[PDB]
Structures are given as C-alpha cells and as structure tokens.
Symmetry: D2
C-alpha cells in the first residue's frame, strides 16, 4: 500500500538478459503491480525471447508470491536510431537485423501507444562505449561521439518520444556512475563524459518535462555490480558500507524514484553505491597502514 503501482504501465529500455539493472528494475516495478514492457536490442531480441518462453528464466522471474514476471510485450529497440531515415543501409541489410522491424525510438513509442495506451513509468537502462578500455588521451572522435550517442542522447530521444504519451505525474529514470563527477581510471573512452552529459540532461529534462508534461526526471548513479573485480573490492573496502552492491539495491531504489512516494523528487542524482560517493579518501591505500 505504500507503493501501489496497480493501474500503471512502465516501459524499460535496455533489457537483454536477467543480470543488468534493466531486468532488476522491471522485476521491482512489476513487483509493485505495474504492467512492464521491454525495449531489447534487436541483435539479441530473438535469444532473449527464446530464453524467456523456454522456462530457463523462471528462477529469475520469480516474485514474492512464487508467481512470475509477465511482460506487456518485448520490443525491438536500438537506442542509436530515433527514426528510420536514420538507419544505415548495411544495418538494414545486417544479418542479425532482418526479420525484426520498427525498432527506432520513434517507431517504438508509436507501437507502445497503439498497444498499451499512455504510460506512467519510463526507465532508461542503456549505455555503450565502443572505446571504454581506452583512456581519454587515446579516445577517438568517433569513439567519444558514439559513447555519447548511445549513453547520453538516447535518454533525450526517449523522453522526446515517450513524453507525449506519458500521463501527468509520470516519471523517468536513468543510470550513471561516479566517473561523471569524479575521475575513475579505467572508465573509459568518453563514457565518463557521456555520463556527465546524462546527469545534466537529467536536470534539464526534469525542467522541460516538468513543465510540458508534468513528468519527473531523475538519475541513479550506481556502484559497480578485470577493471570490475578490482572496483568491486575497492568499494567493498572503502565504502561506508562493508557490503557488495547487488542489482536489487538499484532496482529497489528505482522503484521509489518511479513511485508516487517521489512525487516531489526531480532532477536528482541519487547515489546508490554503499556510500562510496561520500568519501574523500580510500582507507585501504598503500600510503596508510592497515
């Protein structure tokens, strides 16, 4: 009863599998009684769809009841394209792309509207850095510009196209990382920069949609779920909280941002990171004793 989402429909761009935030969020959204549709990268839309209807994901659709997560559709979606005129020929001709169509952001919005009416909850859980391995001084223009297109501008496009089919009081959420605000070596070919752009756009768009649509626009900067393994232990050892960052922690937090408990919350960047954002110094440094 504190979060009754019955009545509400959500669309979640960026669920290819059951291990990302996208999946975790949907799980929670649905868990509060919302209809939940998914945007899925065409290249993997098939495998995901087979992976669902197989039975294979039932341990992961599993809810509080023992009932399973059901979806109001699972749409092809490529956040790199806003409308079909934008799609390059070789992609139209690409082997992993034929069969599936109407996968631009605009096309997907029209589809959601004709299939489910207006929506209440918008999630943006997609980021892509073709040069994330590379440091900024070794990042190309094409690289940088791609990282931003996929990660940053895709939120704006999404909001552009979903906004007009979003109920008053409705809300949207995206995902960021520390590196947006504070240097974090590793991350990665303009990914940091795109994230910064996302957080600014999160703010600007909270103003724009607040006014035109009455829609809340927020961001979660998350901890880490190789570069990673070390990052996981880093946070384990330097966070205010001696604990791992589970995906449910972020899902959990997104549920709130997208519930009417956050009806006055907009333009925010919520750190869901066991509190690492709050330190000005690692305690496990080689320069301190243990």
């Amino acid at each position: 009863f504190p979060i009754d989402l019955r009545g509400q429909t959500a669309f979640v761009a960026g669920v290819a599998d059951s291990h990302g935030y996208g999946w975790a969020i949907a799980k929670h959204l649905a868990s509060a009684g919302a209809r939940v549709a998914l945007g899925t990268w065409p290249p993997v839309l098939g495998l995901f769809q087979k992976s669902l209807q197989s039975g294979r994901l039932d341990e992961d659709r599993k809810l509080p009841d023992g009932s399973l997560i059901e979806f109001a559709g699972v749409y092809p979606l490529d956040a790199a394209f806003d409308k079909p005129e934008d799609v390059p020929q070789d992609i139209k001709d690409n082997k992993r792309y034929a069969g599936v169509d109407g996968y631009t952001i605009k096309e997907v919005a029209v589809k959601v509207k004709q299939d489910l009416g207006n929506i209440d909850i918008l999630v943006h859980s997609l980021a892509n850095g073709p040069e994330v391995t590379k440091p900024l001084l070794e990042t190309s223009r094409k690289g940088y510009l791609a990282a931003s297109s996929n990660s940053a501008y895709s939120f704006v496009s999404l909001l552009q196209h979903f906004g007009p089919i979003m109920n008053e009081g409705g809300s949207a959420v995206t995902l960021s990382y520390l590196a947006a605000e504070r240097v974090v070596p590793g991350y990665g070919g303009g990914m940091s920069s795109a994230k910064a752009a996302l957080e600014s756009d999160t703010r600007t768009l909270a103003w724009e949609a607040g006014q035109k649509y009455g829609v809340r626009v927020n961001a979660i900067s998350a901890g880490p779920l190789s570069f990673i393994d070390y990052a996981i232990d880093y946070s384990y050892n330097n966070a205010p909280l001696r604990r791992d960052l589970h995906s449910d922690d972020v899902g959990g937090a997104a549920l709130f941002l997208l519930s009417p408990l956050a009806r006055a919350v907009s333009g925010v960047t919520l750190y869901v990171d066991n509190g690492l954002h709050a330190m000005g110094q690692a305690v496990d440094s080689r320069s301190m004793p243990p």
Copy 2:
C-alpha cells in the same frame, strides 16, 4: 511491498502535527513500523494531552483508515546530552515541571529498556533564535545556538542511539537548500548549521556505516505576507514541477530512505523540493519577460 513490520523507529522532534516529524512517523507507521516520539519537554504534557483526548484522531488517519499509534512519546530536549549538562534555571524553569530525563543519553536508555534495539532514527530538529537576522547581524551566541540545536544534536542522536541500532538500520535528518546556496532571509546561522548538518551526514555515514553498519542520509526539503509565503510562491513559480510541496512528499521520501529499499543508499542529500535545486535561474525574474 515494502515492509517495516518487526521494526521500530525513533522520531525526534514532533511537537505539532503539521511538521515533517509528524509526516515521517505517519509514513513509517503506514509501512508497519513501531513508532516512538521524542518531544521538546515544554510542549510534552500538552502534546501528549491533545493526543489522548481525541484531538489528533484526524491527523492520525491512516490511509487504510486506521489511526497511527505510538510505542511512546518521550521528553527530548536536543540541547542537552547528559544530565550533567542541564543548567539550574532550566531544571528550575517552571515550563519544565514534572518531566525528567530528556537529555539525549537518558532518552536512549529509556528507549533501549522500554522497546530495545531500534532500526530507524529520524532527526526532525532545527532551531535558531536569530534566524530572521541576516548573517552579518547574527551573534556568536545565536550562531552557536543554531549549530547546537540543528547540527550537533544529530551527532549526539547517533552517538547515543548507534549503540542500540540493529545492523542495516538507517537514520535521516532534514536539511534546506540555503546550506548549499544563498537563500536571503534564512539567517541566524541556520544556513551554516545546515551545511554542517549535511557534512556530518556524510562523515557519520562513514563512521556509523563502519561501526554499527548503519546508514545516514539527508532530505533537503523545500518550503512547507510571510517569508515562507514568498518562498512557497517562488518555488511554485520556478520549480520544474508546478505543485505545492505537501509534507507527505517528504514523508514518503523519508519512508523510502529509512526502508530496506534503500540499503545501498548512504551519505546522501536527497532534494525533495519539486526539482528546484536543479535550477540555475528564475523564469520569474523582473529582468525576464513573462
């Protein structure tokens, strides 16, 4: 859903039933918490009184329709830590007759005995005797007063309650935008008390995070003629979301922050303010056109 059953919450600074403290307790109870109240002793007898008669039965409504009940109402003056710290003219001060043991430490002992370990701790306390006076006209006495009532008290609440707090518990306080950015009129050092308060929220987060495994967060609220009046009007006219800020808004966002959903959330300042913090200018300005 989100389930505070089995859990006990201590809410410091609830005298009226129109403040944030009320709003917050109200919400915690709706989610199934045991709620205890700490009240500034001059208003206790009265407050306790007005509750018990049937006065507040309307303000205790429950959103099912039942009424919120309290596992206790406690005298609490947050200006004092030990009994030792109370000056005589207060011990003697007529306004305090009957009541005993309202120094943070004493409240803790009583709470520990009557109820045992708690999980949720709310700090709804702000007081500054020179608040109407601009900072260049605030005295040392009032500025320390303000810091002593609205910052330190939080530190002491933790110092004394931390010990009785279950691992995974969380505390919250309430801040205001002036602590990061100039709000003319919010004077007396309240501005400064609050920047200290947000800072302690981060420091304590680390410390309590590490020592008791507890989370520490802040809600930076908007405004709930007058100086308030103009404030409300401004925010209504300039915030991304064109609405009034109800106390339920804060109520709900505390309810998220103090709940398991927020277990990876620590050391944050959460703006519950209709988006206003996100703004770099007023659309309202007599410099702009309508």
Copy 3:
C-alpha cells in the same frame, strides 16, 4: 610579479576581438607571454587581414600602452582531428580556399616546428547549431554536433598538444552554469556539451597531470531584446556583486589559472560570474516584493 616571460601560449578560437579568447590572449601577453592564435579557417584571411591593416590596433592596447603581437595566427577548425577526417565538400567548399592544415594534429606539428614546446593552452571553442532549440526539440545530429565542437575538441587539443607541452604547463577551457544547473534557453545540447566539458577537465587533469605533468582547469563564465540581454540584466540584478561582467574579468582569471601562481591548482571549475553560482534564489522574482 607574475612572469610568463620565456613562455609560449596557444589560444584556440579567436576570430572576433570581443570574445574570451581575445581577452585571454591579451592578458597572457600583458604578463609577457608569446601568444599564438588558432582561428576557424573561414574567418582567417579576413581576421589576419583586419589585424595587419591597423584595424585592431585599439583592441590590442596593451595596458602599459604597447600593443599585443602574435607569434602566429593559425587556421584551426576544431571539428577535425586528422586530415583524413575532412569531408570532400569541405575540402572543396569555397569558403576554405587557400588555407591548408587546420586539423588539430596539423596545427600541433606547425606550432611545434615554428615555435617548439608550449606551456599555456587555451580552449575558447563552443558551437551548437540548435542552441536556440530547447533540449526536447534538439536532434541527435545537432547534439552530437554541439558535443563534437565544444567538448571533444578540448580532448583532442590535449591529446595533440600534450606531447609538446613543458612539464608544469596548464590548459584552460570555458564552461557555463547551465552545465550544472538548468538555464532555460541555453539549448541545442550546449548544456550537455558543457557538462561533458567540465567532466573531461577533471579526467584530463588526472591523465595530463600524470603523463605530461600538466594542469587542466575550467572557468565557468557568466554572460558577456536578446537572450543574452535578459541574461546580462538578470545577473546584474541577482548576483552578489552588482556589476557587469567585462571580458577582462575572465581574461584575468585565466591569466591566474594559466600562471605559476596556480601550480597547485588542477581540475577545477572556476566561476567568474559576479558570484551568481552561489545563489539559491532570485531577489528579482515576481513572487517576491521589491
């Protein structure tokens, strides 16, 4: 005093003589620097021309009374990194006739040869073809355009100049408040380009700091009818210091940031804005009284 003698500064993006680039070069020269200029090639012939005739002799005055001289004026289009990246219709585009080698890398080689290692690098470059359009009406094309002109270019400037930069050198770029907080009207993704830009300033600071031993900082400037007009008026009416923002103000603060006085200063955003960033509200509001 502070002494840039023996030192050489490269200032990218000086076409007019009323921008920040002019103001900055002007200041560096006053402190005894060799100053070279990079100019967007369509305006070079002209700019170079107007200099040489005696036109700008008044805007080159020197505060002793002598005139600023340039160790070079260079074609520089910051949209291109290698010659390879130039499209034909540009190579052919009539507006570019005569000039060759204005891709960041080429400019660097020429600068390295003609002058050798530099110590000071200025990035006065911002361009967004959809800036008048709100973010919900900005396209992917223009948004990437904006990022490509006003963010990445900085990254490339460093990538290519870093190599020829003396240890202890410093670079600066220019940001704007909208990158942290919503300024309605500053659209086209310029807002986003700038948040990326401030972010790169921190990342690069680390990297260039470590690799070339160079510092990287930003000046977030105020405004130097119109949308500007209202902006200027607003800031004049709402900033702590009731003054107009001269370009010398920015000029001087770059001059500090690029000088030995600032050798422990890296990765900052410096607001040179009459204090306006510090504000949480307008005293101007039609919600307030006079």
Copy 4:
C-alpha cells in the same frame, strides 16, 4: 603590472609564525606592494614580536628583491572573542594574557581603522579544534561548538567588523579542507563540520558583503602542508600532480583571489590541492595492483 597592489592595505588574521598559510599569504600580498597588518594570538604575540626584531626571520621575510617583509603593525587578536564583554575573567587574569589588550575582533577593527584608515584585503587564516584527534562519535558538544566558534564563526565576526571599514571592490579570503565536502578520517572533532559551515558562510557572506559593501568573499580549500605525514604521501600518490603542496602554492592562489584580477570572483571554493579534489578513487589502493 598584472597584480599591482600598491595603494592597498591588507589585514591578515592568524599569523603566529612563519610556516602557516597566514605568513605565506602576507608574504605574497606584501610582495605585490600592499601594506600588511597581522592579527596574532595574544599568548604568542610576544614571542612572534621578539622573533621578528631579532633578525631570526630574515631568511623568511626575504623577498624577490632581497628586501624584507615589513608590517603596518602586529595586533593582539583572539578570534574567540568579538567584544570585551565576551571575555571570561580567568582569561583577563590569565598569565599569558596580561600586558596585551584590545584584542577582541571589534576592538582590533577599531584599532586598524584609527591606525591605517580603510582596508582593501581581508585574510582569515585561523582554525582551532580542541578535539581534532577524536572521531565524530567521540566528539563532545563543547568540543564541536568550540571547533565551530574558532574556525567558522570567527570569519563572520571578522567580516562584520571589517566590512564597515573595507573599500568598495575590496575582498576577503579564508581556508578550508576537503573534509568539509567529503569524509576524511582523522579530521577531527567537528573540524570537518565547521569547515562545511565556513564554505556556506563564504557563499552567504559573498552575497551579504557583495551588496552592502561591494566586497568579494571567497575560500581556498587546501591540500595538506602522523595523520599528516600519511596525508602528505596520500596526496603525493593519488593527486593528478606528483608533487608536494608547498605553502607558496596557497599563498600564490590567495594573492589572486585578493587582486583585482578576481574582480568578478565571489562565493567560490578554490581547490589548491594538486588536484586531489577531482578523483573518485585512490590509485595506490591495496585493492588495485601497483
């Protein structure tokens, strides 16, 4: 000529010896041709005065020319007291306090005005935490409240009393530390919190003095010049800059904030810390390899 301070008088509260920032700043201020008066803790005013006239400090008064720093007076000053009615009897009777008088902030302002006329530059270089060894959960009220009184409120008092004798265009500066904004274990009995308050007051006071006096109010958050030794190596190994933080680095930076090159700079917090503020992660962590 870029910083000609000839004509200008400065007062610098907090110079007991030649190793603090207070001394470094004066050195630079004087170095730009300013008259510089010093506030000195009465308890040490004698030893400092003897230490000067002895010859002993001549290597440290040493300027660019070979000439020495001269002062327009060296005043007893205790930033814990604003006016004499504030001073406790035992202090008046204290052994290290007799002889010297008129040492409250108000009294010192009157003295400066009657001796030197109006002033142009105000420096606030004093901080005191009687419990800085202790973590926040072990800090007493008296401790906390003292740390703030000495460190935070002393700036406000200073500005209150100097403001009215400060020329239009004049400016003031104070010193802070990371821990204000980000947790730094070690620091220290409410010192962190006071610093947060200082930075807020730095902002508020830039608004107040901007309007009433036309005076710029800024802060330098500095790096570190035991708890320390480790902190020095910490920054050495984790900063964007592989270098030590000399006192001249801060002095340098204060000179700018207090020169007319910063005529548009107010409410700022300038990181002068080899860039440490900019990282979100230590590179020498035990969790990374080296």
